[PDB]
């Protein structure tokens, strides 16, 4: 698996969440 990819995976659902918040 990889660690650096499954963080950034994360941080952009959040991100567009905490931005647009569908």
Do not use: D, G, T, Y
């Amino acid at each position: 698996k990889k660690c650096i990819a499954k963080a950034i995976l994360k941080k952009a659902k959040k991100l567009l969440k905490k931005l647009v918040n569908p």
